[PDB]
Design a protein around this ligand. Structure first.
Ligand code: ZN
Length: 216
């Protein structure tokens, strides 16, 4: 099941019952998650900017007939925190680590909550979510999201997709530490099913090994 906007720059597809993957084109595609809970919609990352972000929010609210209550910002880059202004004026809580919050202000973005610690467990209705800071990699502040009831890992931009041969923007990256950070994710979650990369299609733990390979 896949739903798109008239333009084709925004799509939302179902992973399973309450988990969907949203993708926006900026033409570079960017992934995020949409969690349908008994108490509102929770998103993992926003979109490139405020127009795409408002538009994404509008679609999911229309489809599920619920409000987006929270959003998890994985790092301080446009494809993740691009629509923080949109989120704040709609009363949407933008969760982020303290580091991500200061880096956002540093990049001229409105500041997220800065409430997430190294390991944080959030539960929205019946939907369990865990955020984990593995260390520096793609950016200094990048975190991953884990859904223990489905064993789905949102590696975000710390993980590259299967056909990706480029690590992307490393001007802000910590290439050398990146590998150790992926290892921490691997040691922390032993039984991973699906992993969502920041760009590209959903895969498995093989995506993390693939990324470590690119990093060698
Ligand atoms: Zn990034």
């Amino acid at each position: 099941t896949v739903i798109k906007n008239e333009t084709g720059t925004i799509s939302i597809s179902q992973l399973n019952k309450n988990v969907w993957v949203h993708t926006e084109l900026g033409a570079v595609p960017s992934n995020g998650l949409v969690l349908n809970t008994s108490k509102g919609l929770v998103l993992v990352d926003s979109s490139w900017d405020d127009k795409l972000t408002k538009e994404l929010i509008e679609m999911v609210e229309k489809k599920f007939q619920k409000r987006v209550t929270d959003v998890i910002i994985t790092h301080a880059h446009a494809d993740c925190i691009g629509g923080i202004k949109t989120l704040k004026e709609r009363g949407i809580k933008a969760h982020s680590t303290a580091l991500t919050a200061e880096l956002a202000k540093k990049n001229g973005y409105e500041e997220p909550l800065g409430d997430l610690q190294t390991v944080t467990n959030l539960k929205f209705g019946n939907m369990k979510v865990e955020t984990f800071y593995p260390g520096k990699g793609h950016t200094e502040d990048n975190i991953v999201v884990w859904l223990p009831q489905y064993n789905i890992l949102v590696g975000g931009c710390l993980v590259k997709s299967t056909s990706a041969k480029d690590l992307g923007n490393v001007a802000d990256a910590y290439v050398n530490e990146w590998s150790t950070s992926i290892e921490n994710v691997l040691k922390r979650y032993r039984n991973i099913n699906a992993v969502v990369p920041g760009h590209g299609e959903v895969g498995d733990k093989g995506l993390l090994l693939h990324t470590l390979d690119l990093l060698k």
